[PDB]
Amino acid sequence: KPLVGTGMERAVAVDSGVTAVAKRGGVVQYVDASRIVIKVNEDEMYPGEAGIDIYNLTKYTRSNQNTCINQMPCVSLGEPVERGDVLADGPSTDLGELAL
Amino acid sequence: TPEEKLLRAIFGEKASDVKDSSLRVPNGVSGTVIDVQVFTRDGVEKDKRA
Amino acid sequence: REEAVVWDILDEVIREHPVLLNRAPTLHRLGIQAFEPVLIEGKAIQLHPLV
Amino acid sequence: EIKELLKLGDLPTSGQIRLYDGRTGEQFERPVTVGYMYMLKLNHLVDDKM
Amino acid sequence: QDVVLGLYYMTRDCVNAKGEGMVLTGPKEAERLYRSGLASLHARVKVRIT
Amino acid sequence: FLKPRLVDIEQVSSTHAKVTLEPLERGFGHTLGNALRRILLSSMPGCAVTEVEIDGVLHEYSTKEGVQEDILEILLNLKGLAVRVQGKDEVILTLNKSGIGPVTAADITHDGDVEIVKPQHVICHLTDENASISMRIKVQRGRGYVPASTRIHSEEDERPIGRLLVDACYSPVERIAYNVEAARVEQRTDLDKLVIEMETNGTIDPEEAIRRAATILAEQLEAFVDL
Amino acid sequence: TEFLKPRLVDIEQVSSTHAKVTLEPLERGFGHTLGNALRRILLSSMPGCAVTEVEIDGVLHEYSTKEGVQEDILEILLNLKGLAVRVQGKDEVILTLNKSGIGPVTAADITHDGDVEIVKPQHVICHLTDENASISMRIKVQRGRGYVPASTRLVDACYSPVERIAYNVEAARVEQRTDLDKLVIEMETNGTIDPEEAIRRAATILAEQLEAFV
């Protein structure tokens, strides 16, 4: 994480797709280093199909520059998450901020 | 040539009709193998590993 | 095989045997200068500050 | 604003402190500035260029 | 740069410093004075030199 | 040429402590404190985990289904597990646990010489009702910093691809500080004290440490005293 | 948990006063830990016999000129700090220097005593100019441990044999190790102790302090 910062680092991390952002808010049903399954809140949920949002995380893989791009879950089992919250950090991102 | 022929004669090695093109790790770089992909022409039999 | 015994043999061929060092924009003749090699662990070239 | 946060920090306003050489253990004349700087590793890494 | 900043800080003089005014037989015991912590690096002193 | 001796050794926390040396002549507090800081921070006995063979894991870069820690991250956690042995120079510890919850450092299999100084130390979590992790944790003892890279030269068929190596962290010491305060014994001109404030993972006792430190010290002086 | 010991120590003499010794197999950082710990005790705490209190012939204070000698009182004292001696059974001995006639008054013109050993009889104390030139002094010499300057003490205590000590840690290559260090200890002495003897007795006191921890 940058110890000294500006406040853009959060925005740069999120707007770039490197991280994984919540589609809809709710409580985390399942947390694995592989995927993340969120049980949607009913106010945000559509009537049909009910649903849960399943995020399949990217794991260790080659970048164009031959670096490693790997996502890590930043949330814990059964925790409230709101829409537009960071679900998993990407490479060089910490808890939603941008750490280069 | 003559002296290579004596060498094989002494040590009794059958020099193959095939030359070695095998892919080997570049000099000095060392790591762990995390994946293997096998692409095959359509119609050639996929080998065991593939 | 990089057998351990070879490093000492290299110290022989290196001792008195200058090497040429050169930088990117060679301007005057000092852009290339001869030095006596010193074997150093690591992948970086070390260069005397005064030069 | 920075100096006040250093007051809350328990650390001097000058931002400099006394440092001791780990070899002789003796002090260093003058205070030296010590702190925390964010530092990046660019990829020129030596075992490519070489 | 670093080298000349060293020598500048070496031969320089402040107005009052440890060992000011004393006299020494030669450079050998001058370093002995400094390294031991008795005398400051810069202080006005008469010493015998050759 | 009056010689020193130790004095009250004050434990404060399981981590750090302040040892003291009372009879030091002029300036000898510095001559030792720096010379002692040197060997303390560097050469000391320690036992850090080295080879770890886990359940289904081929390499440190995968993820075990049912645990939210990447394998690479779990290996790093092991490098920070503090333990101590007595009569063995390498012991292989078997860790087993399952069920939803944290897998701490107290869930391992106790051995006669096993002392876990931080039973709460988090190895990794467990995210599913039935998910089980078995690992053979091979802990050895040594000196200094031996990175996992320099280990693969002897090799000689370490074929167990499931045996993943980690970096050797061997050392008890974290932070060492020495302060020399003037010690006034009832009759003497001027004498000094030595306050050595050190910081440790709890795997070495203060009196033990300072001896082997000074031990190596005089042992190197052996040659010195002649030519 | 075995620990590496040195080997090879070729001793290169530079004349008879000083020399540069070398030690090849020192592990990481041990070159400084040793080189510095020995530099520390060499320059500071050492047995020595120097000159301290000087009561002279006619002129009591340092601010004057003795008739018949071209050296200012201050300059002659500096020569005294550099007179190297050794005693045997005395912790202080008071000698007596006498001489006259045109010429240098050296260190061999003093009165020899049972415990007096002058290591540099040629050492120039001062000259003696035109006429006969009177000079006699009772020189009070004491014994101690270290360098005690006249200010804290009337001359500075030179007791240390050592003049200048330098240690340099250069990288030592052991046959199958990365980087190990060497130790180049260049020492300097007044000649009342031989270089090889000193560095032994220096470390001796060192280890002698460890005697409650071995």
Domain CATH number, residue F35: 3.30.1360.10
**Whether residue G53 sits in one domain with residue G37:** no
**Whether residue F72 sits in one domain with residue F150:** yes
Q: E-contacting residues of G 83-102, CB under 8 Å?
A: none
CB F68 within 8 A of CB F102: no
**Which uninterrupted H or E stretch holds F139?**
strand F132-143
CB F207 within 8 A of CB F9: yes
* Residues of chain B positioned with their CB less than 8 A from the CB of F61: 32, 34
In angstroms, what CA-CA distances link E25 with B13, B37, E11, G106, G118? 83, 80, 19, 17, 19
CA distance G79 to F57: 80
Angle at G20 between CA G14 and CA G23, to 5 degrees: 150
**Whether residue F181 sits in one domain with residue F166:** no
CA dihedral F33, F35, F37, F39 (to 10 degrees): -150
Task: For residue G178, give the chain C residue with the closest CA.
Answer: C41
| Greatest CA separation for chain A | 47
CB G87 within 8 A of CB G51: no
**Whether residue F154 sits in one domain with residue F52:** yes
Neighbouring residues of A60: CB distance < 8 A, sequence distance ≥ 6: A68, A69, A70, B34, F61, F62
* Residues of chain A positioned with their CB less than 8 A from the CB of F63: 32-34, 59
Helix (H, G, I), strand (E, B) or coil at G6: coil
CB A98 within 8 A of CB A35: no
CA distance G68 to G132: 8
Q: What is the CA radius of gyration of chain G?
A: 22
Task: For residue G179, give the chain C residue with the closest CA.
Answer: C41
Q: Which residue shows structure tokens 């001097």?
A: D12
User: Phi and psi of F210, rounded to 5°?
Assistant: -55, -30
Alpha carbon F66 to its chain centroid, in Å, reads 31
CA distance A89 to A98: 9
**Whether residue F96 sits in one domain with residue F71:** yes
Chains F and A make contact, 3+ CB pairs within 8 Å: yes
Closest CA to G139 of G111, G162, G117: G111
Neighbouring residues of F202: CB distance < 8 A, sequence distance ≥ 6: F14, F15, F82, F117, F118
CA distance F78 to F166: 8
- Partner D contacted by C28 (CB < 8 A): no
Closest CA to G42 of E41, F2, E47, E31: E31
Which residue(s) pair with F139 in the sheet? F49, F91
CA distance F66 to F128: 6
For G105-144, give the DSSP string. Answer: EETTSB---TT-EES-TT-EEEEE-SS----EEEEEEEEE
Chains that touch B (3 or more CB pairs under 8 A): F
Using left for φ > 0, alpha for ψ between -120 and 50, and beta otherwise, residue F80 falls in alpha
Tell me the two tokens of residue G37: 């710990």
Helix (H, G, I), strand (E, B) or coil at C8: helix
CA distance A8 to A22: 19
**Whether residue F164 sits in one domain with residue F60:** yes
Q: Which of C41, C43, C46 to mutate to test the interface with G (most CBs of G within 10 A)?
A: C41
- The parent domain of residue G94 ranges over 48-159
* Residues of chain D positioned with their CB less than 8 A from the CB of C42: 46
Q: What is the CA radius of gyration of chain B?
A: 19
Asked if the Cβ–Cβ distance from A4 to D43 is below 8 Å, we say no
Which residue(s) pair with G144 in the sheet? G48
Angle at D23 between CA G211 and CA F141, to 5 degrees: 65
**Whether residue F195 sits in one domain with residue F219:** yes
CA distance G189 to G17: 6
In angstroms, what CA-CA distances link G138 with D21, G54, G55, G56, G100? 47, 7, 6, 6, 16
CB F45 within 8 A of CB F37: no
* Residues of chain C positioned with their CB less than 8 A from the CB of D46: 42-44
CA distance F196 to C34: 50
Chains that touch A (3 or more CB pairs under 8 A): D, F
CA dihedral F112, F113, F116, F122 (to 10 degrees): -80
In angstroms, what CA-CA distances link G33 with D19, E29, F45? 18, 24, 19
CA distance F144 to G28: 10
**Which uninterrupted H or E stretch holds E18?**
none
Closest CA to G99 of G137, G130, G62, G147: G137
Pairing mode of beta strands F163-165, F45-54: antiparallel
What end-to-end distance do the CA atoms of chain F give, in Å? 24
CB F119 within 8 A of CB F108: no
Q: How many domains does chain F have?
A: 2
F108: domain CATH number?
A: 2.170.120.12
**Whether residue F166 sits in one domain with residue F102:** yes
User: Exposed/middle/buried for B13, CB within 10 Å: 0-12, 13-18, 19+?
Assistant: exposed
**Whether residue F17 sits in one domain with residue F81:** no
Asked if the Cβ–Cβ distance from D38 to A65 is below 8 Å, we say no
Smallest Cβ–Cβ distance between D38 and the set A2, A65, A67 belongs to A2
* Residues of chain E positioned with their CB less than 8 A from the CB of G39: 35
**Whether residue F57 sits in one domain with residue F38:** no
Tell me the two tokens of residue F17: 């402590």
**Whether residue G88 sits in one domain with residue G35:** no
User: Exposed/middle/buried for D7, CB within 10 Å: 0-12, 13-18, 19+?
Assistant: exposed
In angstroms, what CA-CA distances link F147 with B13, F6, F48? 43, 36, 12
CA distance G18 to G186: 8
**Whether residue G109 sits in one domain with residue G10:** no
Asked if the Cβ–Cβ distance from A32 to F61 is below 8 Å, we say no
What's the DSSP call for residue F54? E
CB G28 within 8 A of CB G172: no
What resolution, expressed in A, was reported for this entry? 3.9
Side-chain-facing half-sphere of F207: CA atoms under 13 Å: 9
Q: How far is D16 from chain F (nearest CA, A)?
A: 19
Picking from F124, F151, F170, the residue at the C-terminal end of a domain is: F170
Q: D-contacting residues of A 49-68, CB under 8 Å?
A: 65, 67
CA distance A92 to A12: 11
Picking from F148, F170, F192, the residue at the C-terminal end of a domain is: F170
Structure solved via: X-ray
Pairing mode of beta strands E46-47, E23-24: parallel
The residue type of D41 is: K
- Chain C contact residues (CB < 8 Å to G): 4, 7-8, 39, 41
Q: How far is D25 from chain F (nearest CA, A)?
A: 5
In angstroms, what CA-CA distances link A9 with A3, A22, A92? 11, 18, 11
- Partner F contacted by B31 (CB < 8 A): no
